Amino acid sequence: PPAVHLSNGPGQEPIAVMTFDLTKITKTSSSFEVRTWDPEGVIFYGDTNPKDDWFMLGLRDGRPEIQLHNHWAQLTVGAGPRLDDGRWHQVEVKMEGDSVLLEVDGEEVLRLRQVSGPKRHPIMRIALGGLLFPASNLRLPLVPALDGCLRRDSWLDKQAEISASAPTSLRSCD
Amino acid sequence: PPAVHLSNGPGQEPIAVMTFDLTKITKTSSSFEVRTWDPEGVIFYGDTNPKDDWFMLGLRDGRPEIQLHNHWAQLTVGAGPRLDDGRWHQVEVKMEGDSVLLEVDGEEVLRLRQVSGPKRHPIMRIALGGLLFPASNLRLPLVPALDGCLRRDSWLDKQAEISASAPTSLRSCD
Ligand SMILES: COc1cc2c(cc1O)CC[C@@H]1[C@@H]2CC[C@]2(C)[C@@H](O)CC[C@@H]12
Ligand SMILES: COc1cc2c(cc1O)CC[C@@H]1[C@@H]2CC[C@]2(C)[C@@H](O)CC[C@@H]12
Ligand SMILES: [Ca+2]
Ligand SMILES: [Ca+2]
16 A cells, blocks of 8 residues: 655654544544654654643654643553564554553553543644654653654544645655 | 462452662662463552552553552553463563663563652552552552462562561462
């Protein structure tokens, strides 16, 4: 299938931004394949409010890292095997009850429990390959640029998708 | 080497309690091997204050789980492969800067970052196979009894160890 580069130019911004109608969401999971030799960077960032309800999945020291900041939890957690071996890796991130589940290559590697509740606005934004605020604003800053490739990505439900933007045309890893 | 049973009788209390002088601690890591077919239970609990500075490592759905409650963080997190396959597994838990690192069979499977700071009293208690407060007091309750075996366990520095207790004689898995 067609693969896209996760970074463009200086790698200072996302390659794409998707907006979703929270009230129209029926599927709270996303999956994709990623390949990279880069040990650090942002795979995706998401929020309902950059001020107080945001989430980031990235790599640090080659391994998956999640940072989360919302009403119920504030955390910085590393888990899973290194993914920077230049091989394609399947990744799934989903909400399971009050938990966030991270699966890598079919195996559950991390489950953040009690991090959700009955999230700011009825709109969720998902940015690929970058953040929607300065990196200095992360709980634990890292350099966002992730020199890798993304393919076979499915995000929530297309029916709940409000819109999609791209600062520039998506560069193919072909 | 000699192995010990992690549960006794009804599995309502720890098989042993160790107390340490925080000010005498130079090594902030522990390691041990565990074997079990039990998917849920407490491997060890530790605190400096059962009221507001405690930590628990156990199994839930066969996989490692850590619950932590202190001044800097409050979390419930699952990670790593299932350990309830009846095989011996090496486990290491250590403090690395402001993080808690969990290694299983030589592989880092979880790193809780930004959970420590410059912890209540100068005394730390470590209880094996049970908690030092009701299970209902966990962030996420579980049934503490862990039907497994422990061996080759090293806890912090023997020099910092103040005392050790055991409600009853340690039952051998021999
Ligand atoms: C658990 O709390 C939160 C979680 C989340 C967010 C905010 C929270 O407060 C924003 C991005 C979300 C992610 C949960 C997992 C999602 C749905 C992925 O499948 C795609 C976008 C991700
Ligand atoms: C990160 O914060 C905390 C961490 C901890 C405790 C309290 C905290 O507030 C108590 C038990 C400790 C564990 C850190 C890891 C230790 C040292 C293991 O090697 C043996 C006992 C464990
Ligand atoms: Ca990078
Ligand atoms: Ca049990």
